[PDB]
Structure formats: structure tokens, C-alpha cells
Amino acid sequence: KITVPTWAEINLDNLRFNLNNIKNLLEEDIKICGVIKADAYGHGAVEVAKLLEKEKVDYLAVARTAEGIELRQNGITLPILNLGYTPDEAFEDSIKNKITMTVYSLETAQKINEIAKSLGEKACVHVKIDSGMTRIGFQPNEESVQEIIELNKLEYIDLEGMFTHFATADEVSKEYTYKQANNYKFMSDKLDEAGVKIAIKHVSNSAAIMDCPDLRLNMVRAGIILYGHYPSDDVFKDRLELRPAMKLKSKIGHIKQETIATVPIGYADGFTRIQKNPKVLIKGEVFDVVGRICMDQIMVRIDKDIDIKVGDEVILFGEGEVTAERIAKDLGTINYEVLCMISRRVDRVYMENNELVQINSYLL
Amino acid sequence: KITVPTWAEINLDNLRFNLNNIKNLLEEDIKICGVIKADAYGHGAVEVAKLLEKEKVDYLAVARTAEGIELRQNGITLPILNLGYTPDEAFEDSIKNKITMTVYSLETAQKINEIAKSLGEKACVHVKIDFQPNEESVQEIIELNKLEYIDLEGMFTHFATADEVSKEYTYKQANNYKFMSDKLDEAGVKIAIKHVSNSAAIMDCPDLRLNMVRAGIILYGHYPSDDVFKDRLELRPAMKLKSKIGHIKQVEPGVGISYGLKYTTTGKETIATVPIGYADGFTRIQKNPKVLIKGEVFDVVGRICMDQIMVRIDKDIDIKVGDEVILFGEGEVTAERIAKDLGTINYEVLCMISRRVDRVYMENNELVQINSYLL
Ligand SMILES: Cc1ncc(COP(=O)(O)O)c(CN[C@@H]2CONC2=O)c1O
Ligand SMILES: Cc1ncc(COP(=O)(O)O)c(CN[C@@H]2CONC2=O)c1O
């Protein structure tokens, strides 16, 4: 069944476990947006979306029009929100495929409106508020409020939602986070007061869902925690029990007498050469990767008395002491990036009840 | 029509230039193997293969059965050599798709042979030498050569240090190969294709041509190191990683930017947000990330996010949303620069370009083709 030497194993059971533990945090009326941008953080957006439609979630979020359309082309019917920039070249496609667009200027809204009029159907949009991230969004001021009342009047636009995003909600002190929330509440209250109707207000990411049970509003945005990982070591982990879903695996391709094992995974699979202390798990024991990581393979020193043969399974992360977090720490980056590094040629294989149920090649 | 906010622009003209300058190094009868593993080092294996069939090259090389089969599924007819490991689970598919397999041992050759027998057609194989270069290996090879449903077509080794200043070790490896080559010549064994040279060797070692050379990094317009003889071979990089300015704003003094608010403004600043992030392969690890906009270099500020970055515009330029941003492949922003910042190599920076980044191909300064790996 598996014909590639190196694959990403995704445990669908663990995803369900994570989602259900997330849902147990939430009250009945609070909506869940499943964040599945960057191919569901490396796990496979189409498949993870299929699971989310089954488990019933209220919205899907992506980072790009094309990620949105890929989901549509694969049968997905859930509302999809592009969280970021939509270039003008992609408005038509967004509207035709019912992808909800993030909007953060009146100019953008007006051009979208012309296209939606042109096509003779409404564009659904969510307004972004820059509450403290300084990334995307309207500033939280009197000027933005009027610009929003204005864009709300554009026939051929359904101003459905409004959101902001926290820059430091995974840190110990939530001061800045609540400072951001207040900037949002400013816009929320002024628009409430201006008779502008916004069905979906949302602000909470994974960190906020966990640590800030007062920031639920109409909906929350669950990303990293869906996949079985914490946004940091500083969040209240005891609130939510998680199982990581991804195991990055290869096979022992060669053995040689030190005993050196050659494994057919390299930096072009996302096992980055930058790692200063690369390690692997084999038959429950951790071993050093030795010499430079190559494009398509690495050499590992077996310095323990284990019976090991060509074909035996190697785990790069997702089990025992070899974790995406460990690699991230070695890199000086974050688990998010390690997950997203898994490259195109790495087949995603999905497990369920300990059976392989599906294998996706991104080449064939 | 480009509809993605972030793309990898591949200049086909430059690829042709590189290949032709490579061909000018080579004598009439020496074959070229175009190394296009890892999706042609991020440039697009299918398209680069199409170009190579057009420009005529002898052979294609890949790192994985599936890379080989992807090329076949897209009409490619050139010989393809899997340079790396073929698991037993993939022998059948290799043979059925005429993917030439690298072999290291008699035992592997014999199993392949059974499958080829089973399928009633020959497997094409190339022998790899570290097969120790001793008398034992030479008989083992004369043995495998006999096996009926295998075509022992070629034999090769690969240099570990040919891009360094001193090749001593390289010529040490070459000798070990020449031992095997001469003993098999002397036995009855044919070997139509003997090859050893990678990009570094093609450049610095004009005596290691044999029947064929393996051109990789150089094809794409990059040098395997700073130590090779660059003056022998003029290269034009083929790839430009680009995005668009997605948002632009004037930010007050002392305001934090991005996760952890690790950059705070030091006066009023113009901040451009660009829709490229670490999940497009613009790694967050970079300590000094930069971008080129309207010919000027700018600092990326605050943490690089999954899907976007913040850029301080501190020069009097006229920039509007939609304007073009270059992450590398032009002027001072190069894959090599990023590699050096990271403590890795240009090879890795090229290969980091992720699936969602559309490859768009240019030719005479016109867009001729756009490939989405999502749609
Ligand atoms: C607008 C927005 N909402 C929700 C999320 C989900 O966050 P969690 O995954 O922490 O729940 C992200 C993630 N943005 C990624 C996370 O890291 N860097 C980024 O840009 C985001 O940009
Ligand atoms: C067997 C073999 N031959 C030829 C090449 C071509 O190398 P150049 O790109 O230098 O021409 C490679 C690339 N191997 C890559 C280069 O860096 N690390 C690797 O594992 C290879 O593995």
C-alpha cells in the first residue's frame, strides 16, 4: 500500500479526540472555526476538512483564495473564510466559489462590490480590525467606524463578521491581549450603536480559547490545538488534553558497519539541514543523525544493541521523545513551522482505528 | 493571469542559457544528465523536464520513484534514473514506468530480477560504487550483469567534496572508480554509461567526464559553492520568489509588531504587510530577513508569520497595494544571502518553496505558463 520511502502519517482518531476536547470547553451556542490554512498545518487541508464537515464545525478558515478553492473542488460545502489578503485578480473566483473574504479597507470593499454586482450575487465579507498585532486590519478609531458603516451599505456585500487577532495570547500575562480586546470592543460598541449588524464577531485563537474563556463572542478560531499541539508552554495545558495527529516517518534504506544507517529522508522533505542536533527514533530508542543532512537522505549512528534491518521504521517526529516541539527548540522556531515544513513529495497517509484508510500523493 | 498573491517566477530563458553554457564546457560525445530531483530543486520538475526534452539532454535524474513516475504521467519519454533508494515495494512500479534504478548489492539486483522476470520485461539499472571498490564487488557485478531480465546500463559514484578548494579526496574517489571500471572492462562487462561528475566536478575537473555528467545546481543558475571556478561557467539564476503588497499603513512610535511584539517602532513608520510567510518556505528562522521593492532593500520586521510578513518602508518610494515584492532572485536579495543568514546552503533555500506557491514560467519576458499544485 505505502510505496514511498518517506511519509507523513496522520491519525484521524486523534484529530477527533482533540476537536471533541475543544468542543467540551465551549458552550452550546459558540461556533467553531477550524483553521486549516497551509494545508491544515501540513496535515492535509482537504482530508482534515472532510473530517471537520463530518464532526460538524461552523466555519473553515484558510490563508489563500486557492486553499479555499481546493476545498471547494473537493466537495467541501462549509463556509470558508480567507483570513488574509485577497488580490483583485482573485475577487471573482472568491465570489463564484463562496469564499468569505477578509476586508480591511473601504477601497477593497468597493472594488469587490463592483465584481459582485457584475456577477449578480453578493460577496460575503468579514472585516479585520488591527487591535495590536499591527499586521492586517482597520485601525480601531472613529475614522474606521465610518468607513465600515459605509461599506456595510454597499449593495452586493454581505458584511457577515468582524474579527481581530491576538499577538501575545500564548504568553503568561494577558495584559496586551485584553488591551487588544478592548480596541475591538470599541469598534464593536460603536457599530452596535451605529445600527450595523454583524452576525459573527470573533477574536480568540487557540491560546485565547484555552486561557481566556471571556473572549468567546460568537465564534472561536481553533488552529494549532486541532492538530494536537499547544501554541506555547505558557498556556493552561491542564485545561485541554491533546493528541498530536502527525508522525513523520521513513524506512531504513541501508545499513553498514560504528553502525551507520542511511535513511531516505532529507532537507527537501522538510527535515531541515539547519538542525544542529538532529535525532530519530528507531525501535523505541533515540539516535543521533550524523554528518550534514543531505537533500534526500541522512546518516544515523546506531550505538545500541538492537536488531535492526533494512525496511525497519524510522520516526522523525510525533512519538516519544522526538517531537515537533523538540526540533523547533533546536531550531529556535516554533512547532507551527516544523509542521508546515513537510514538503510536497511526502505522501500523507491517514490512519483510523489503526488501519490505513487513505494515501495522498501530491505528485500523482 | 496570476491570481495567487505569492508565486515562484521561473525564467525559462535563463535555464536555456545555463544549459547552453554547460554544453559549451562539454565535448560533442559527452552526455548530460539533468538532475531534477526535489521538483527540480523547487523550480518544477515536470516543466523543467519538458524544457530539457526540447533542448535535448541524454538523461533525467530523480531522488524518488514517485518523482520519476510524475514525469512519466506528464508525457516525458527521456531515460530517468532514480539516484536514490528504491524500496522493494516500488520495484514493480519502477520497471513498469521505465525508471532506471540505482543498485548497491547483488541481493537487490536478484530481487529486482525476479520482479522483472515476473513482469516479463527487463529492468534497467545503474550500479553505484562507494559496492566497495574491491575484487569481491567486481565479481559480484559480473554476476549481476548476467541476470537475464536486467539491463546493466551504467555505473557511477558521487563525490563528497568536489566543491572544495582541494579535490585530493575527489581524485581519491575517482581512482577507486577507475579500479572498478578497468577490472570490468577487463572482465567481459560492457557498461554503456559510466559517470561520476556532479556540478562541481563538471566545472573544476574536466578530466572526469567519462560517458556522461550530472548537472544539478548549475542548471538552475547557482554554484555548488564559492570555492569552484565560477569564471568557467556563466550562470543566470532562474527563480524569483515574489509576492504583492497586501496592505500599507502609517504606524505610530512605540507600537509592537507581530507575535510576541518583538519589533516595536522607533518613530512614525510606514509598514507594508506582504502575504508570504514561513509556510511558503520563507523561514521564520532568518535573523535578518529582507525584501526588495522598487529596487530598494527593506528590513522585514517582527516575527515572520505563517502566511505573512511586515516590512518597514524607510525610503521615499512610491508604493501602492498590489506592488511587487521580491523575496529572492534579483539584486542583493539572493538565495545565497538567505542561506548564509540561516547557516545552510542555496540548495535548501530553493527546495523550501512550498506546495501552495504557484510556479509561473516566463519566456521573453512574457508569462507563458502557470502551475498550481493545489488545483
Ligand atoms: C487570523 C488568524 N486567526 C486564527 C489563527 C489560528 O491560530 P492558532 O493556530 O494559534 O489557533 C491564525 C494563525 N496564524 C499563524 C500562527 O503562527 N503564525 C501565523 O500567522 C491567524 O492568523
Ligand atoms: C547522486 C547525485 N548526483 C548528482 C547530484 C547533483 O549535484 P549538484 O546539484 O551539486 O550538481 C546530486 C545532488 N545531491 C544534493 C546536493 O547537496 N546535497 C545533496 O544531497 C546527487 O545526489
Author numbering:
A (entry chain B): 3 to 259, 278 to 384
B (entry chain A): 3 to 132, 140 to 384
Which sentences from the paper describe this structure?
The second structure is that of the co-crystal with the inhibitor cycloserine (CdAlrcycloserine). Cycloserine is an antibiotic that inhibits Alr. Two structures (CdAlrK271T and CdAlrPLP) contain the cofactor PLP, while one (CdAlrcycloserine) contains the covalent adduct of the inhibitor cycloserine and the PLP cofactor. In the CdAlrcycloserine structure, cycloserine forms a covalent adduct with PLP, d-pyridoxyl-N,O-cycloserylamide-5-monophosphate (DCS). The formation of the covalent adduct prevents the covalent interaction with Lys39 that was observed in the CdAlrPLP structure. An additional hydrogen bond is formed between Tyr268 and DCS that is not present in the CdAlrPLP and CdAlrK271T structures. Several hydrogen bonds are retained in the CdAlrcycloserine and CdAlrK271T (CdAlrPLP) structures, notably those between Tyr43, Ile226, Gly225 and Tyr356.
Alanine racemase (Alr) is a pyridoxal-5′-phosphate (PLP)-dependent enzyme that catalyzes the reversible racemization of l- and d-alanine. Three crystal structures of C. difficile Alr (CdAlr), corresponding to the complex with PLP, the complex with cycloserine and a K271T mutant form of the enzyme with bound PLP, are presented.
